Design a protein around this ligand. Sequence first.
Ligand SMILES: NC(=O)C1=CN([C@@H]2O[C@H](COP(=O)(O)OP(=O)(O)OC[C@H]3O[C@@H](n4cnc5c(N)ncnc54)[C@H](OP(=O)(O)O)[C@@H]3O)[C@@H](O)[C@H]2O)C=CC1
Length: 387
Amino acid sequence: GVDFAAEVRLADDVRPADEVITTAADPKEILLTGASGFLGAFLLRDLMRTTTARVHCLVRGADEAAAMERLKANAEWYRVWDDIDPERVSVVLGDLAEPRLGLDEESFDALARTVDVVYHNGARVHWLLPYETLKASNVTGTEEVLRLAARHRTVPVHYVSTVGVFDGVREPGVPLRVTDPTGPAESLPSGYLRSKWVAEQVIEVARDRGLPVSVYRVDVISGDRVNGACQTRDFVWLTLKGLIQARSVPKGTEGRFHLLPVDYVSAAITGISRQPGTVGRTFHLFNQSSLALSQCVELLRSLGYELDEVDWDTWTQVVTSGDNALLPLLDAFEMMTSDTDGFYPPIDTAETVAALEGTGIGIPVLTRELFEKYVAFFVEEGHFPAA
Ligand SMILES: NC(=O)C1=CN([C@@H]2O[C@H](COP(=O)(O)OP(=O)(O)OC[C@H]3O[C@@H](n4cnc5c(N)ncnc54)[C@H](OP(=O)(O)O)[C@@H]3O)[C@@H](O)[C@H]2O)C=CC1
């Protein structure tokens, strides 16, 4: 068993420099981690649109040219590369899982001295791996990012977290507040969520030492509202994919999905990060609105997919018979449908709506058109079968 109370520690060298900058209006040099991933591609695009800064992107790879091509191909898959200015993209070859982010002395020192703000979005998101395996990327990597931001000149870190650090609701029916206790780690169902919980706790120590660190706890991210571009391996779309594959759905089974478009998340995080009086605070990004499971099924039926209603046993035997995206998620699908309110605790977002007042930034409505864009993206990219 992991002693999670002992895992909450920040190396004593991670402390504010003599100069501490708490805002980053009009930044000139930005460090972004996780730019070769889903949210990171949209964070990169939005920083291009909302600053004039060069964006140093920490990317793993053999050499800068190969890392650049990885970053590019990811952005092209999400259909945002055309919105990015490559002349403002600077690849920083490194690794969240190794000391000083895998940088050499010259690069570490130069970024520590000159980056105006850090968006710490990179992490290893694996729903099964144990905490011990994810610690280096997700916890120690966060400590290393904090080390870099703090050293020489202290600049703000904007850390992407998850509403999953909560173990359900504090008081029934009361939306979870940004100040509410999280964890305990042992109550969280995955090593991944436990690693994010530890990172947050490490960040609380940094905050207690005077280091400027904002935290954005994000819920499930769905595709962008323009092209529908979305990662493939999340519970929502694998659930719907499984139903499509099984060509059926269990009778009398209802649930919901709180979809949060990725381009809302990127715009919100970057937008809040410039709003006044937000540095050092924690924010919840969560869509109060949802699409019911029955709504998704009806929408898929209207697109031409065969989804016959069958008894639970017949359905689960189809799913467990092989080649079905839901098979490893059957337990989660059953928990979500049998106690949906328990599965999706209410989340308070008032601080988030207030900070975004007047920014033009808002969650899109979950329309039929939006849903159809989502399915169309997966069908074109080969992730969903055609109807
Ligand atoms: N539904 C969601 O997607 C949600 C996401 N989040 C948070 O969003 C952030 C983005 O995750 P998401 O975009 O979803 O997942 P992705 O897997 O798409 O992005 C993960 C990113 O982390 C980077 N990364 C992982 N390990 C390392 C490493 N050792 N060294 C350097 N870079 C590394 C990956 O780089 P490479 O390409 O080299 O793997 C990739 O750029 C994460 O902090 C996650 O916790 C929170 C809540 C919900």
